[PDB]
From a paper:
GrlA and GrlR are two LEE-encoded regulators that are required to optimize PLEE1 activity. (2) GrlR, a negative regulator of ler expression, might act as anti-GrlA to establish an additional checkpoint that down-regulates the feedback loop, setting it back to the steady-state level. In agreement with this hypothesis, GrlR interacts with itself and also with GrlA to form a macromolecular assembly in the cytoplasm of AE pathogens. Here, we report the crystal structure of GrlR from EHEC refined up to 1.9 Å resolution as well as structure-based functional studies on GrlR.
The model was refined to a final R-factor of 0.215 (Rfree = 0.269) at 1.9 Å resolution with good stereochemical parameters. The GrlR model consists of residues from Met1 to Val111, with seven additional residues at the N-terminus (Gly-6, Leu-5, Val-4, Pro-3, Arg-2, Gly-1, and Ser0) resulting from the linker sequence of the (His)6 affinity tag. The C-terminal residues from Asn112 to Lys121 had no interpretable electron density and were not modeled. There are two molecules in the asymmetric unit and they are related by a 2-fold noncrystallographic symmetry approximately parallel to the a-axis. The GrlR molecule mainly consists of a single domain from residues Asp5 to Ile107 that forms a β-barrel. Residues Tyr59 to Asp70 form an extended loop that plugs one side of the cylindrical β-barrel structure. The β-barrel cavity is highly hydrophobic in nature with side chains from seven Tyr, six Ile, seven Leu, four Val, and two Phe residues lining the inner cavity surface. During structure refinement, we noticed a small molecule composed of 12 atoms in the hydrophobic cavity of GrlR, which, subsequently, was identified to be the fragment of Triton-X100. The strong hydrophobic cluster at the dimeric interface is maintained by the side chains from residues Ile7, Ile23, Ile25, Val39, and Ile107 from both monomers of the dimer. A loop region in the crystal structure of GrlR, residues Glu46 to Asp49 (46EDED49), is highly exposed on the surface and is less well defined in electron density.
Numbering used by the authors:
A (entry chain A), B (entry chain B): -6 to 111
The structure:
């Protein structure tokens, strides 16, 4: 089962990710965790941020292919606030992230551990 | 214009990548370059490798979703050899990568620099 735990407890490695927005649009991507560093992306945007702790974990989202819609229909670069605690297992986790400054704009994410860093 | 250069001279950061295989199947993905470390993936596989410089660069491809076809139709994990030489810019590059052990199996890749990492 999943249990509330701090994100920083996540094992280092590459994860597969699936997410759905308040607009009810879905997307899938990849996520890489190294130290407290988080980098990732899907066919249209890439994301980067640093596991906070003592700070609001901010994830900078950057769109790179506008011929593909944003799961959030924003149309520019934004920030997602990552929860300090997530529901997790040794290899699975879910979290609810919302756009900074707008709780009504959000995505629910499920992440699955794929493998350790080389 | 693109000029021949050492692949290991690529700017660290997040890259979008598009590729076509000898079988005429195309795929798209993301690629992250940190030090000599390269990590990335698409909707069905993830990859990790180390920009060598004294050894042929081996990119380890791990298939994580077998419900989606691989651009090479290998049906298992494999290794790609990454050229020490690439045709590149300060933001673009292309390369021809063959499967370790079989030059007849390969992907021709175009990579676009998206943004540097934190």
């Amino acid at each position: 089962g999943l249990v509330p735990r701090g994100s920083m407890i996540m094992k280092d490695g590459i994860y597969s990710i699936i997410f759905i927005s308040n607009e009810d649009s879905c997307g899938e991507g990849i996520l890489i965790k190294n130290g407290n560093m988080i980098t990732g992306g899907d066919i249209a945007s890439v994301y980067q941020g640093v596991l906070s702790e003592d700070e609001d974990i901010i994830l900078h989202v950057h769109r790179y292919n506008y011929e593909i819609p944003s799961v959030l229909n924003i149309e520019q670069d934004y920030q997602l606030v990552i929860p300090k605690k997530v529901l997790s297992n040794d290899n699975n986790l879910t979290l609810h992230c919302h756009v900074r400054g707008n709780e009504k704009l959000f995505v629910d994410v499920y992440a699955k551990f794929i493998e350790p860093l080389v």
